[PDB]
Design a protein around this ligand. Structure first.
Ligand SMILES: OCCN1C[C@H](O)[C@@H](O)[C@H](O)[C@H]1CO
Length: 664
């Protein structure tokens, strides 16, 4: 009703929305539209306007002052200059005197020039005028986000164990590796629920295999781990290894389930297994086939998966590599200095994630051929869709843990996302924080970043501050790249500080799970910018390093090295709470306004809003062992809290039995 859909040309059906909106037949209601050069929408912003949205994208909560390109890309260096990361989340909200939301339902490269060229000018452009643009009206940004959340369908809901702590590393390969992790945590009584299995668990990186040498009785290992409340979470990649006798490959070739070149052959992309084919994720029969392969792991006791490299990432194509070797032979023969090393270096970089390669393969959509670049940002989304749909077919009532690196709006119904390859940088604590509300606006609630940083070398104090933010993010996972300084919690001196921080997570799990469930079930946000909760407070609307969570608390993590506290702005009176390393809970009332709060490395801070309280459990070492029967309430006298809790396993969300009222 307050949502209208403006159709240009003949757009591709992304299935991002679950709700049907009729095509509007009036002139576009904001700014101006031009087709002189592909498609461009231009809008002149007021100087006080804030722009929210874009889900997983670079920089801040207010998107003004830079350029953002929705073009799912495998880029491990998230510096401020980058215009594209892994996600394509084409929803923005202009917020000010004039307020409206826009969703550009377009599956290809889409450029958001948000004051980059001229500060007052918002320009959104793409190559082809074949798209739907949804215009959402409302009193404020928050109401517009809520309408949007309604029409894109309910967010993915994880199983409760996924709210525990998880540990992973690109490098764990053998039973011994995994047992050392289990032992490193359990014998030091650091809580944990999950261990991630990265690409080395497979036989030569073949999807839907297990290295039968390292795991000759894999279901028995899965049980050994699960008996200790440790759930193994295996990676699945986009590329299917080319290899004779490998059933997944053979089936794919025989039934034409792979993406093909223009000449009809199966396109070759080299990734971890060397030569691979990509399953045609936009083909329904291929998707059913590919998703059903997950049963191979599910039958073995596996309850969760993560999907990687699904941009899809390409190290090189056969075509790219041939050009590379040819160039290199010229370089090698050059004696006159006609070919500089720089040109040689550039060619080598050019064959990776090449825009040319994305034009070299096609999807078969219900019989019709579509060049991949035209639908590039739909790939990772449909790979995760394939898995989610398969889960429904095998056990309609069971929640599986599922999250994906690349995504597009619509995928939020089928899995979460992690924020990809960050770095052990202090700036990435803050980057992690700012991405949270924007993802929430776009449907992606189950999210998190690699705690401690994926690439480069972490330090003890950096890992502790990351963990203290991760305490509040639904996906809380310590994961590192190969070759990095080891960053399992037991690798550092005074490990009692890591126990204290992760203890805080487990004490908060019933509250955090409850808020997640209440928000997901009501198409609402888990994390919100302060401006959404205090929209009449000009100071509050511009705060970017604090977030509101549910309706009870605010978080404000320390993200500066050597800092012993940080500044905060409280838009109302709050109780400043700290989980202390001795197990106690420090509390102090603070009035509305500016404060510097002391927060030590081994203290986890939060703020409880006036007239609110939250339940806190005693610390336990796995989700199953959390005692929720008579939790302590922290916060304001005379307040109450409605706890959501179900069995954490099935999908019986609609019971009054799931809710109970607690009173301080
Ligand atoms: O080329 C790298 C592929 N992968 C990228 C993922 O983002 C990361 O989490 C993972 O550890 C890594 C190895 O599986």
């Amino acid at each position: 009703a307050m949502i209208r859909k403006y159709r240009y040309g003949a757009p591709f059906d992304t299935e991002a929305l679950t709700e049907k909106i009729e095509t509007a037949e009036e002139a576009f209601p904001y700014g101006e539209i031009s087709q002189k050069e592909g498609f461009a929408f231009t809008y002149i912003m007021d100087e006080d306007d804030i722009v929210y949205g874009l889900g997983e994208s670079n920089r801040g909560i207010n998107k003004r002052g830079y350029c953002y390109i929705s073009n799912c890309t495998d880029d491990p260096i998230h510096t401020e200059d980058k215009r594209s990361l892994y996600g394509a989340h084409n929803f923005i909200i202009v917020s000010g005197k004039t307020t409206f939301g826009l969703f550009f339902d377009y599956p290809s490269k889409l450029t958001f020039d948000i004051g980059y060229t001229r500060m007052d000018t918002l320009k959104v452009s793409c190559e082809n005028a074949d798209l739907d643009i949804y215009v959402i009206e409302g009193e404020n940004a928050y109401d517009i986000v809520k309408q949007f959340r309604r029409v894109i369908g309910r967010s993915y809901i994880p199983p409760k164990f996924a709210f525990g702590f998880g540990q992973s590393r690109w490098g764990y390969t053998t039973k011994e590796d995994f047992r050392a992790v289990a032992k490193g945590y359990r014998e030091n009584h650091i809580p944990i629920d999950m261990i991630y299995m990265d690409i080395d668990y497979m036989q030569d990186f073949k999807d839907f295999t297990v290295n039968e040498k390292n795991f000759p009785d894999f279901p028995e290992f899965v049980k050994e781990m699960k008996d200790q409340e440790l759930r193994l979470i295996p990676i699945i990649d986009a590329g299917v290894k080319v290899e004779k006798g490998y059933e997944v490959y053979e089936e794919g070739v025989k039934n034409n389930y792979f993406c093909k070149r223009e000449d009809g052959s199966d396109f070759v992309a080299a990734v971890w297994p060397g030569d691979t084919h990509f399953p045609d994720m936009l083909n329904p029969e291929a998707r059913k086939w590919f998703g059903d392969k997950y049963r191979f792991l599910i039958d073995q006791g596996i309850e969760g998966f993560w999907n990687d490299m699904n941009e899809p990432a390409i190290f090189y194509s056969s075509e790219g590599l041939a050009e590379a070797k040819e160039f290199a032979g010229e370089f090698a023969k050059d004696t006159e200095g006609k070919i500089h090393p720089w040109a040689m270096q550039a060619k080598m970089k050019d064959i990776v994630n090449s825009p040319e390669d994305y034009k070299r393969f096609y999807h078969n959509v219900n019989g019709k051929k579509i060049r991949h670049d035209k639908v590039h940002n739909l790939f990772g989304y449909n790979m995760t869709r394939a898995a989610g749909e398969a889960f429904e077919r095998i056990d309609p009532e069971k929640r599986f843990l599922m999250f994906s690196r690349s995504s597009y709006i619509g995928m939020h119904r089928y899995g979460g996302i992690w924020m990809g390859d960050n770095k052990s940088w202090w700036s990435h604590i803050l980057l992690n924080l700012k991405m949270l509300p924007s993802l929430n606006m776009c449907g992606f609630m189950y999210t998190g970043a690699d705690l401690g940083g994926f690439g480069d070398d972490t330090t003890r104090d950096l890992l502790l501050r990351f963990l203290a933010l991760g305490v509040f993010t639904p996906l809380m996972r310590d994961h590192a790249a190969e070759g990095t300084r080891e960053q399992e919690c037991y690798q550092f001196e005074n490990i009692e500080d890591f126990r204290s921080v992760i203890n805080a997570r487990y004490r908060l799990v019933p509250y955090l799970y409850s808020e997640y469930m209440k928000a997901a079930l009501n198409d609402d946000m888990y994390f919100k910018p302060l401006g959404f909760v205090y929209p009449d407070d000009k100071m509050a609307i511009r705060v970017e390093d604090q977030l509101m969570l549910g309706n009870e608390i605010m978080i404000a993590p320390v993200y500066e090295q050597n800092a012993r506290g940080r500044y905060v702005y409280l838009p109302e009176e709050m109780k400043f709470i700290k989980f202390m390393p001795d197990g106690s809970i420090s509390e102090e009332v603070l009035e509305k306004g500016v404060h510097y709060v002391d927060v030590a490395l081994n203290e986890v801070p939060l703020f409880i809003r006036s007239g609110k309280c939250i339940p806190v459990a005693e610390a336990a070492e796995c989700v199953k062992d959390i005692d929720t029967e008579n939790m302590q309430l922290i916060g304001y006298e005379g307040s109450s809290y409605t706890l959501y809790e179900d069995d954490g396993i099935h999908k019986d969300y609609d019971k009054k039995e799931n809710y109970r009222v607690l009173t301080k």
